[PDB]
Amino acid sequence: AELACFCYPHLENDSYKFIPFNNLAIKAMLTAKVDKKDMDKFYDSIIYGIAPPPQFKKRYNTNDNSRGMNFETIMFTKVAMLICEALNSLKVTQANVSNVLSRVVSIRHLENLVIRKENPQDILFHSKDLLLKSTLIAIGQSKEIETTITAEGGEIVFQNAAFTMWKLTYLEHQLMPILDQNFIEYKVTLNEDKPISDVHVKELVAELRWQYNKFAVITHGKGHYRIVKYSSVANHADRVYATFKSNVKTGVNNDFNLLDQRIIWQNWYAFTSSMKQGNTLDVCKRLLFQKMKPNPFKGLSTDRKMDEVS
Amino acid sequence: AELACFCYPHLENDSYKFIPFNNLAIKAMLTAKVDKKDMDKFYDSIIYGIAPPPQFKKRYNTNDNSRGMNFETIMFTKVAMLICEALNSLKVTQANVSNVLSRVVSIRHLENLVIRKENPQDILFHSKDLLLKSTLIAIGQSKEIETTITAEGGEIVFQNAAFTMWKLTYLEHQLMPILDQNFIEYKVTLNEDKPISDVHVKELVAELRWQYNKFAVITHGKGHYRIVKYSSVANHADRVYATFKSNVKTGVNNDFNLLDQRIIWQNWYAFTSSMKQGNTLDVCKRLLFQKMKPNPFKGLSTDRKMDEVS
Amino acid sequence: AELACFCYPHLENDSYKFIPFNNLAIKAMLTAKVDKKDMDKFYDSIIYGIAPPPQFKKRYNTNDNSRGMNFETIMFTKVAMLICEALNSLKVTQANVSNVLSRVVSIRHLENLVIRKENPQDILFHSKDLLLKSTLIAIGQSKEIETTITAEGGEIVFQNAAFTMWKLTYLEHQLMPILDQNFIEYKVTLNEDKPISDVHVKELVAELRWQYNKFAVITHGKGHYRIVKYSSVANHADRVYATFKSNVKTGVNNDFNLLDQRIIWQNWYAFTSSMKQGNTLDVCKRLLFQKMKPNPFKGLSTDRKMDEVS
Amino acid sequence: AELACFCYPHLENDSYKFIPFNNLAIKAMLTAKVDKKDMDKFYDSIIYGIAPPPQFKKRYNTNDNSRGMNFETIMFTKVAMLICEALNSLKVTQANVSNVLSRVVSIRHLENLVIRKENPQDILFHSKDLLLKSTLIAIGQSKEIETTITAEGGEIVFQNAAFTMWKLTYLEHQLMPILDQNFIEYKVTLNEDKPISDVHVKELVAELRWQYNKFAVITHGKGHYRIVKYSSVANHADRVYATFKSNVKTGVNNDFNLLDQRIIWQNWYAFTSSMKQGNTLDVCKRLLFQKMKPNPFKGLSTDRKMDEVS
Amino acid sequence: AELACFCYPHLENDSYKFIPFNNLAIKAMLTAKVDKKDMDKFYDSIIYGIAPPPQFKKRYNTNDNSRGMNFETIMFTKVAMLICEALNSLKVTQANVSNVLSRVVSIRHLENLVIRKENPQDILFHSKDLLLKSTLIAIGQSKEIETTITAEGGEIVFQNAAFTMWKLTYLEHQLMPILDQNFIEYKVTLNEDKPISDVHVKELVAELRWQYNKFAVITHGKGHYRIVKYSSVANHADRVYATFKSNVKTGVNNDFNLLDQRIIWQNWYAFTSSMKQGNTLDVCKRLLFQKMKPNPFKGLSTDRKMDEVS
Amino acid sequence: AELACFCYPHLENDSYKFIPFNNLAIKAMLTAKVDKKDMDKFYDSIIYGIAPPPQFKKRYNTNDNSRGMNFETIMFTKVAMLICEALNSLKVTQANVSNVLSRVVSIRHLENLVIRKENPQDILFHSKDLLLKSTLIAIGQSKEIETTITAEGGEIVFQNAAFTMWKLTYLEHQLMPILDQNFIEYKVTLNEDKPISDVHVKELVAELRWQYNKFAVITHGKGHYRIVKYSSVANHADRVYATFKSNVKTGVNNDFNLLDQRIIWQNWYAFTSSMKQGNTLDVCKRLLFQKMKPNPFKGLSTDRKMDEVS
Ligand SMILES: [Mg+2]
Ligand SMILES: [Mg+2]
Ligand SMILES: [Mg+2]
Ligand SMILES: [Mg+2]
Ligand SMILES: [Mg+2]
Ligand SMILES: [Mg+2]
């Protein structure tokens, strides 16, 4: 959903502060009759303050809508505050306000950060500057790359010198949980942005082949690996391509990190290298469905299997 | 119930302060044997302080009484405090104390205000002067008209530039809930006290005809619409008339706002216009039961129906 | 789903008997690896007997599939028995078996009949020939028209000399309940197949205008009215048309009862009269979205409203 | 545990009938003081009948013993009856009684058969001769090979023309459940005892490599595959060897079916082929821990992965 | 309580049959106003049949009485039936009826027999003649001695060739449970009425010294041992003496089995041998409180302790 | 477990402070792939701080490990803090840090101290110096002897001028409870370290013989008695000997307090006196299993028994 779904802008001393919505103001908005002239304007409830633009009604779950968010949970307020805390660390100028609030962000990413920020064991609980960097990356108002320390979080299921792998907890989420219960996705983040030695890559690939054999290793180009079910690689190719296409139409720069060719699924490296060369979706997606002949380390499966036998 | 059911007056520096009753003092009063000479005087429990006059015993629920209030709930204290907070914002002089405490008020209205005052999303939680205006209107110690910002509250089910419509939550109430579970009533308050354009009236009437077709649109003359079941319009006519009659006997001024003739139920506008002309109950009530031939906007039902089909 | 999802055919003395599936046989089928040569053939589990053809896997709910049926409930067995009881009342010859088992039927209709058959108050519990007629209509192996006595059932919400109106209980269903909780549909069945006097039609239309004002009165042409939300008339038009189209391609006769023009929604009568004239979907569906100028009984709303006021 | 833990022998007309123990007779036995002269003799409680020999005390769970069985469950009686039903289908002669009752059997195998026998969907519920064959195989009083139709049961997780694979449910068991909750074991039984075509083997191996990559495919030589965690192959090698060794000392014939070399784990085929050649445990077990260079079908993993991508 | 608390006599063909009371007839009796002339006569409720004599009111628990029985439990009916079943196995003649019904019996003993009779594992469930012998002993209408096979029952906590020891379950009882939760009593019954070898006595005494060191071994003279807390031996001496005294006044024969002098508590053997010589209570009870110098088997404690160390 | 399982060292101003681990840092460590070069080094999670050395993985309960501790309970943090509070009361120098953190301690002892420290009735709650002395004794960084005031705690079941006896509550523990539910152990601590008069010893031995007859009175040499089941004396002899042996190899001084010969179990005094003379395990352990002929106070059992009879 867009940032304008959680906060509205307020000017103070020619510097913009952002304010979370009340959920009762959202609920009043969803019952409002509004002119089409006013659907892009912020709504005013008399009782509960300002509400998002009525054009965003579909972002909110209703008796009719299940494809939105659960805006009446406490989590909605925590995520709105988190966004607002980060938008206020910038001082957005009037020229920029409409653009920042238009940015579409992952609610599940933001919720996971709240879970990190409120956990006293997590470094984000103790470093207001780390949390701010983490949130700024999430809401796309920073060009730093998400790494382990700035990751959205989840359950750590594997760690080594170079990588931390997280299980994404989206089924348990309060604000916008994934509905199909057959969902499983993992994330591999970089600990540092340095080059990685071959042994630390071998360790990762061994774990993925042994424990995540039914998962593809892909990426959306923003610097980290995503461990997704093979039955969903086709949908991921669609969304990655739409984003690559939409950014070519808008002029936004498309720098896509293909990551290590030894870790990424071979077919996915093909589909995304082709995409990075400029080919259309159909040229690109057909490479997902080919069976390619060749790979990087051999016998990794056997080593781990023989370790278990002991 | 009368204001004297929640507070008693105490003098300090020739200015009256009001003090909420303890519910255990009420419970002691309900067991007291009192002279008829003393039934209009405030009762003294030895253990729990002052108690309402014993003539008010019927206002309180007992093993025998179900037509009173649940004075032992925490809500009774909150409502008593709310009343007392407003009575203390005035400085009632000795000549006036008996009259203010004699005023009969809607407990359900007062309870709903408590629900607004204790809700951090509600403007009443943040504006002590709005809350005071709201309470003063409720306890009839102000001649301002209830509007959306000063409304008793409830669930917002419709809003536009001119109107907010509230569902009255009286079944869930703690202090004096409505007992029949077949109850449904709605309230339409004015957002501002200005004149209203024809489009904003058309929007309201369309919603009422489409979503509240089984409800009459009536008013008690105090500036807002009440959406009530047709099976209860007869009882409402009684109470509105009794009030109009009792105020003619007492000399209290009867200014009755008939509201927009395009919104009010046609028959009800008739019964109340006749009442405002001075006719008796029987002349007036018989106009409720006539079927009148004609109305203000045609095809509003069809427009909304055709919108839904898309 | 097709009849072959609940029973398989077995020959005895050149007369076909049908046998319900075990749900564990279905569960074994859903784990089976089967040649494409064999996907239209009945599956053999070793432990639990015969199972439906693997081409029907999608009809059954899985960890992956939610758009099928809950075949592991007791209700699945009751519905399979009901089908089988009716298929055995016929003696289907070898030429016919594949055609009967190919027939697609409403599981919710069949489940509702089970609820009637097992209820000792219901005439279906007492008349094995009524139940058989009811089931034969449901599984499309009879050309009699569904009437009140043979209806699928539900909660009776209105009855008069000519009509019974049923609320469809599909949200509570065990085998294939409707998932959106915003669902409400009603059914109006004929008590007898005779002509209906004008007063009995006036009674029905009055109830629908007063109590079901937010519902369209439509029909699928098989002899009874369906009371559906206006927001769903578009989807109903699609399915009715597909059926009318698919039967023109297959040569199946399309007799469509347009029912009383005074009861059916005006726009729907148009879309279906146009369909019955042979026009394409787009010519027909556009008549759903027009606003037409004129209707049959006037003042019915007012009469019922005035009755309530008393 | 030994068969003498569930039944005792009783002679009628020079033919032996077997009788299940009462669990209260077992409980009396566990409190009994018995001469060492009598520890191999059946115990007599006065109140509850005959009880197992006191030398079997350790087979029964106590406040002190957790490595025995839950003899006070209803399941103990069902398993005792099942054993007794099968022992009575034979007519064991006096020379044989001590030998049959000495036979050690898998309680979990017997419990699983009870779960099949009491399930109306299961063929064992309907065929008293199949159930008897199944039980006779289980209690080692038959030289037929366990196949799908005679299998102990469990959840079917894969089936094809040649094989059925079962998940062993031992954690849910009442009489002697597996305690570590980290347990998972699967069983692959033959549907028929015929030769198996190469495609049906390819189908099995593809499923095992894709869905059971973290499992070894081994066998105990009695005609079916066992899918066990690699971390437990070492323990299985011990038990298989002890049995092979103990049968060489006792003269019992050791026919060990090595099954298909394309399905069995390569190392396990080695350890068991060596065992079948007569080598000692240490020569044999060391072959489990080698990493061997080569295998039967290549690209099976890739085919299944590419199927999922579609 | 007396037998007349559970049944009343009814004559048929000059042979007496006994009939259980309805608990509602008892409840009517406890509200009845009755002449003192009629307190020893059976009461007639009009609605529920015959009720016990009103002189027995104190035997029944009331809002006022806790020292009686819970006559409204199902257990009361089962115990009444058990008594009645045994009274009907005799054919009590008119001369005898008043005497049998006057007999005072242990309700807890009778309840325990019901628990044995309704247990399919218990021989009493299968032998109507054993159950009858057991009940006849209990209600003192038989001079046979209670043994293991005829015991009242409970949990078996020790058994050997000569003895069975039972834990008395009186805290869990439905009809008349022991109220202090600090209660523990055990019973040692003879398996046969033969002489007992010295090893089987050594086994019993070893178990009592090791596991029941805080318990006295006493007897009430009726052929079995009672394992009671030392803090209650004084009360037991009272009741045993009262019975021995009351039977000397009534002429009932007093045969008191002193049991094995090696098993009985030394002091208790003294108090009861003195009682059997004719001394008064004070001569006898003072022997309970002496500390006597010497005993039968030495080192039994040490043997059992050393067994445990291994 | 070793002290390094709860805290890691941090240097400040050439004085060492110790810091508790986060349990999420431990959980990240248990998923980490670590070089063998690094298994003795403290682990760094990026998100949750420092974690114990990976060589300690087995000290922590996992889905696979039940023989470790429940490090995710709040109790783990309280025990880590308690350790850290005591390690910081010392100022451990760099030479010493590795040695202190290597010390193996009783987690159950530490948990019991937490239960004392957080109890406002306990003197440890009020005396930070008593608590520190108590913890320093527990973690073996003090040579004072545990006494009643510094005891680990538990339920007091007996007290006199010289001794307090505690029931060890290890089954209820959160961090590392004893799993067998058949566990019972008691502790007898000295109130003062003075000589004890003969009457106060007689009082203790009387209580142990009467109420703990099935328990051996032993000691591990550190100044207090342990009341353990005879069935476990053999295991205790093993552990006491291993400690005595391991300290002879390491040069740590072995001062073993044999305590009062009148209180200790005779056989145990023998096994430990022999151990203190230098004999091997087999010479020593065989003295546990002998039956020795003679003891200190006679008739103590009889006195207590006779007290109870009154
Ligand atoms: Mg990415
Ligand atoms: Mg009004
Ligand atoms: Mg139809
Ligand atoms: Mg095998
Ligand atoms: Mg006796
Ligand atoms: Mg010690």
Q: Would you write up a description of this structure?
A:
This is part of a larger assembly, with 6 copies of chain A (310 residues). Chain A is α+β, with helices and mostly antiparallel strands and 310 residues long. Chain A folds into 2 domains: 1-144, Rotavirus NSP2 fragment, N-terminal domain (Alpha-Beta Complex), CATH 3.90.1400; 151-309, HIT family, subunit A. The first copy, chain A, is 39% helix and 14% strand. Chain A has 11 helices and 9 strands. In chain A, the strands form 3 sheets. Chain A has a 5-stranded antiparallel beta sheet. In chain A, strands 1-2 form a two-stranded antiparallel ribbon. The longest helix of chain A is centred in the last third of the chain and has 18 residues, at 233-250. Chain A is globular. Bound molecules: magnesium ion (6 copies). Chains A, B, C, D, E, F: Residues 143-310 form the Rotavirus non-structural protein 35 C-terminal domain. Chains A, B, C, D, E, F: Residues 204-240 are annotated as: RNA-binding. Chains A, B, C, D, E, F: GO terms for molecular function: ATP binding; metal ion binding; nucleoside diphosphate kinase activity; ribonucleoside triphosphate phosphatase activity; RNA binding.
Small molecules held by this entry:
magnesium ion
Strand content of chain A: 5-15%
Text of the CATH class of the largest domain in chain A: Alpha Beta
Helix residue percentage of chain A? 25-40%
PDB class: viral protein
Keywords: Rotavirus SA11, Disulfide
Entry title: SA11 Rotavirus NSP2 with disulfide bridge
Chains A, B, C, D, E, F: Non-structural protein 2
